[PDB]
Design an enzyme around this catalytic site. Structure first.
Site, PDB file in Angstrom:
ATOM      1  N   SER A  21     -11.590  11.168  -4.478  1.00 21.18           N
ATOM      2  CA  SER A  21     -11.272  10.702  -3.137  1.00 21.18           C
ATOM      3  C   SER A  21      -9.750  10.613  -3.033  1.00 21.18           C
ATOM      4  O   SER A  21      -9.062  10.582  -4.054  1.00 21.18           O
ATOM      5  CB  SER A  21     -11.886   9.319  -2.884  1.00 21.18           C
ATOM      6  OG  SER A  21     -11.241   8.299  -3.652  1.00 21.18           O
ATOM      7  N   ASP A  67      -6.431   8.565  -0.833  1.00 17.93           N
ATOM      8  CA  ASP A  67      -5.977   7.467   0.036  1.00 17.93           C
ATOM      9  C   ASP A  67      -4.885   8.046   0.954  1.00 17.93           C
ATOM     10  O   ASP A  67      -3.939   8.692   0.472  1.00 17.93           O
ATOM     11  CB  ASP A  67      -5.420   6.305  -0.799  1.00 17.93           C
ATOM     12  CG  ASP A  67      -6.491   5.619  -1.649  1.00 17.93           C
ATOM     13  OD1 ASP A  67      -7.637   5.509  -1.188  1.00 17.93           O
ATOM     14  OD2 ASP A  67      -6.187   5.178  -2.775  1.00 17.93           O
ATOM     15  N   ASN A 118      -7.294  10.033  -6.232  1.00 11.97           N
ATOM     16  CA  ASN A 118      -7.998   9.258  -7.245  1.00 11.97           C
ATOM     17  C   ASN A 118      -8.826  10.260  -8.039  1.00 11.97           C
ATOM     18  O   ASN A 118      -9.933  10.620  -7.640  1.00 11.97           O
ATOM     19  CB  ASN A 118      -8.905   8.226  -6.576  1.00 11.97           C
ATOM     20  CG  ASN A 118      -8.143   7.326  -5.621  1.00 11.97           C
ATOM     21  OD1 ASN A 118      -7.190   6.651  -6.021  1.00 11.97           O
ATOM     22  ND2 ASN A 118      -8.531   7.335  -4.345  1.00 11.97           N
ATOM     23  N   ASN A 158      -9.154   5.158   2.317  1.00 12.41           N
ATOM     24  CA  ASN A 158      -9.902   6.068   1.469  1.00 12.41           C
ATOM     25  C   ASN A 158     -10.819   7.062   2.202  1.00 12.41           C
ATOM     26  O   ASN A 158     -11.635   6.680   3.060  1.00 12.41           O
ATOM     27  CB  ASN A 158     -10.681   5.248   0.442  1.00 12.41           C
ATOM     28  CG  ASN A 158     -11.201   6.087  -0.685  1.00 12.41           C
ATOM     29  OD1 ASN A 158     -12.285   6.649  -0.589  1.00 12.41           O
ATOM     30  ND2 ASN A 158     -10.423   6.193  -1.763  1.00 12.41           N
ATOM     31  N   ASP A 170     -12.760   9.627  -8.943  1.00 14.48           N
ATOM     32  CA  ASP A 170     -13.884   9.807  -8.035  1.00 14.48           C
ATOM     33  C   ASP A 170     -13.697  10.876  -6.972  1.00 14.48           C
ATOM     34  O   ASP A 170     -14.485  10.948  -6.046  1.00 14.48           O
ATOM     35  CB  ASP A 170     -14.330   8.477  -7.407  1.00 14.48           C
ATOM     36  CG  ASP A 170     -13.313   7.887  -6.451  1.00 14.48           C
ATOM     37  OD1 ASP A 170     -12.363   8.576  -6.019  1.00 14.48           O
ATOM     38  OD2 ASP A 170     -13.479   6.702  -6.118  1.00 14.48           O
ATOM     39  N   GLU A 191       0.801  -1.223   0.000  1.00 13.63           N
ATOM     40  CA  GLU A 191       0.000   0.000   0.000  1.00 13.63           C
ATOM     41  C   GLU A 191       0.843   1.286   0.000  1.00 13.63           C
ATOM     42  O   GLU A 191       0.627   2.173  -0.817  1.00 13.63           O
ATOM     43  CB  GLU A 191      -0.977   0.053   1.187  1.00 13.63           C
ATOM     44  CG  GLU A 191      -2.168  -0.901   1.136  1.00 13.63           C
ATOM     45  CD  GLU A 191      -3.130  -0.663  -0.026  1.00 13.63           C
ATOM     46  OE1 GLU A 191      -3.073   0.389  -0.695  1.00 13.63           O
ATOM     47  OE2 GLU A 191      -3.958  -1.552  -0.274  1.00 13.63           O
TER      48      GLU A 191
END
Length: 130
Positions: A51, A53, A46, A60, A49, A35
């Site tokens: 959002s 991380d 991202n 998220n 959309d 990750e």
């Protein structure tokens, strides 16, 4: 902070992650590795959309933490996303525990399915004394 392998392993064990909801420490190590590369300040936007991380486990903003700019988001961990960028991983761990309390468990992270599931993950904790 970028953790060294065994340092992180010992830290997670002390925070009670070994066997938490049936998830072995080696699985948590494999997840953090893929990750963020064990990097607490890792962030990834991202664009598709809107959002983001955040942190060592790349949680998220649509579900786990609040950053304010994510549309139709919830904050299940009841934390500001800034909390997931600290060198101290206590909050990120508390939030990770919350994520796996849902039915999907560790499968909630797609990277775990791609890089850790059904594999020999012993290498992640070998020689760390955990």
């Amino acid at each position: 902070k970028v953790f060294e392998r065994c340092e992180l392993a010992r830290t997670l064990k002390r925070l009670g992650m070994d066997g938490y909801r049936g998830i072995s420490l080696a699985n948590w190590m494999c997840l953090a590795k893929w990750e963020s590369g064990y990097n607490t300040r890792a962030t990834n936007y991202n664009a598709g959309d809107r959002s983001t991380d955040y942190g060592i486990f790349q949680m998220n903003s649509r579900y786990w933490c609040n950053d304010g700019k994510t549309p139709g988001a919830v904050n299940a961990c009841h934390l500001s996303c800034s909390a997931l960028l600290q060198d101290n991983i206590a909050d990120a761990v508390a939030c990770a525990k919350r994520v796996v309390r849902d039915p999907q468990g560790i499968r909630a992270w797609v990277a775990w399915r791609n890089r850790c599931q059904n594999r020999d993950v012993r290498q992640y904790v070998q020689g760390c004394g955990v």
